[PDB]
């Protein structure tokens, strides 16, 4: 008997979680979970396979859904309404878009990586670069090989982390000081990429 519901604040900046609603609902770790966003179709969010999903900028104004599957039974869930905007985000991105801009970050994957070393994540008009002091870690011009999106798993920092695949086989997970910086960096990168005729999105995004 599959009975679950999506809980959490339905706005950019928070996390949503599937929660059990009955005593005999199997544990979610034994289920297969897949998150989707409405387009009247639903589009799969690739890699969003955990019981927690943090919305990112593409999710704003969309209903989110989770399918949960166990042993041939399935249940399709939806948020109460569309994911709301983050207050002030548009205006902040508009101020950043005039500039040719960097963010303090921590790198949490390149394999796991626990460092308190602050790196700088430069989102430029034509390229992104990741630096630790004077050492450049990776530097790439916007292209079809690059992906950039909100991270698709759990953890307390998911709403403030993004995934960047610089080019095939080279990817990072990066965490910002706040949700607002994380989201502004995704929106800004995407806008600069679109000016360069590149559609910068996460793996399999539509």
């Amino acid at each position: 008997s599959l009975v679950y519901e999506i809980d959490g604040t339905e706005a950019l900046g928070s996390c949503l979680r599937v929660r059990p609603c009955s005593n005999d609902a199997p544990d979610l770790s034994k289920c297969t979970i897949q998150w989707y966003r409405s387009s009247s179709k639903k589009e799969l969010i690739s890699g969003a396979t955990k019981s927690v999903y943090a919305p990112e900028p593409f999710d704003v104004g969309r209903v989110l859904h989770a399918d949960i599957i166990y042993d041939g039974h399935s249940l399709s869930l939806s948020t109460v309404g569309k994911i709301d905007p983050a207050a002030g985000l548009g205006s902040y991105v508009e101020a950043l878009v005039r500039k040719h801009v960097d963010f303090n970050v921590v790198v949490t994957q390149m394999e796991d990586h626990t460092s308190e070393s602050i790196h700088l994540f430069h989102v430029g008009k034509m390229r992104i670069k990741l630096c630790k002091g004077k050492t450049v870690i990776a530097k790439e011009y916007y292209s079809s090989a690059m992906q950039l999106c909100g991270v698709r798993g759990g953890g307390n920092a998911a709403a403030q982390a993004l995934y960047w695949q610089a080019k095939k086989g080279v990817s990072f997970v990066i965490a910002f000081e706040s949700e607002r910086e994380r989201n502004a960096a995704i929106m800004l990168a995407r806008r600069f990429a679109c000016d360069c005729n590149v559609t910068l999105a996460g793996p399999e995004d539509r």
Partner: peptide, 12 residues
């Protein structure tokens, strides 16, 4: 990419 879905934790 397993990375895209790993838990992200902080304790900046």
């Amino acid at each position: 990419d397993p990375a895209i879905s790993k838990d992200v934790v902080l304790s900046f």
